[PDB]
């Protein structure tokens, strides 16, 4: 795609006039910068066979977990995605060997999770590219845009973090 | 979830020093602010049967469809979801009486896509509760704020926009 048709969306908007088209622009680019954020992180971790559900739990483990795991309830806190791609995101890296339960259902009500030693190496092998991944695609600001938007993006989740 | 833990992650991150975290932040939040959004929109129409991408859909030719609809090429272009969510949803549509072709597989090769009378009443009776949600969702971000976020999301799906 391009961002030349901004501007064709701009006018259908304004069409429906019978006070500006900002608000629904803003969220249709963030809907394609997420899709478009989406096809370039999963560069790094396809040749290795998981979506980004199963990285992303992987990787919160990594930076997040003590040596004996988070709760499955602290790892949705700390994790990046929390959805319905989610659902059976435990259960598949459990059957593919790169996490493992600690204590299952025995003396302490629900189990912890963390990475197996396959499970550790792969991240470690794939940080290096999420990190260069993750640099490149924010290259086009300026880094202080790039706080900015950190700024504004924590802002307005903050603001939607509230229930009614 | 806060953004109490921004911190947490911030010097978990920094423990893998043996220079700085805010491009992984960024994206987090971003992923974050994405499942948020996603939660807050949906309340529109929900009640109605409808997941993302099919309302995404029925919108996009509300706002944009000419009188004898849009080729899926450019139905895809003009739309803000194109992933895999994608996938079922014009042959779901269909399926539900909100959209219709025009000429099938006759004389101009493939079909162009457009609403149908209830699809039009649909997308008008939802439509004030959308752009409320859409205004809503942004109203904690002053305005030019909310153009200086219009700007740099821009900007980097821009940036992103060329392939290697
Ligand atoms: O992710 C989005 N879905 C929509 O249906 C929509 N509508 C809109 O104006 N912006 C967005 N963003
Ligand atoms: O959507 C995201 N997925 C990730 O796996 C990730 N990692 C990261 O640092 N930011 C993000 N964002
Ligand atoms: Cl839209
Ligand atoms: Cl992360």
Redesign the pocket.
């Given at each position: 795609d391009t961002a030349a048709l901004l501007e064709r969306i701009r006018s259908d908007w304004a069409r429906l006039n019978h006070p500006s088209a900002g608000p629904m622009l803003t969220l249709l680019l963030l809907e394609r910068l997420?899709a478009a954020?989406?096809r370039e992180?999963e560069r790094t971790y396809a040749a290795s066979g998981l979506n980004?559900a199963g990285?992303?739990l992987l990787?919160t483990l990594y930076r997040s977990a003590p040596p004996e795991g988070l709760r499955p309830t602290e790892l949705s806190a700390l994790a990046?995605?929390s959805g319905p791609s989610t659902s059976n995101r435990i259960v598949r890296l459990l059957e593919k060997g790169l996490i493992e339960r600690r204590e299952d259902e025995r003396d302490r009500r629900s189990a912890s999770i963390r990475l197996t030693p396959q499970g550790r190496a792969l991240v470690t092998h794939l940080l290096p590219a999420?990190?260069a991944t993750?640099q490149r695609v924010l290259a086009p600001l300026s880094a202080q845009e790039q706080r900015t938007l950190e700024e504004l993006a924590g802002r307005m989740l903050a603001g939607l973090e509230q229930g009614v």
């Open positions: 997420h954020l989406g992180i980004a990285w992303d990787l990046a995605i999420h990190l993750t």
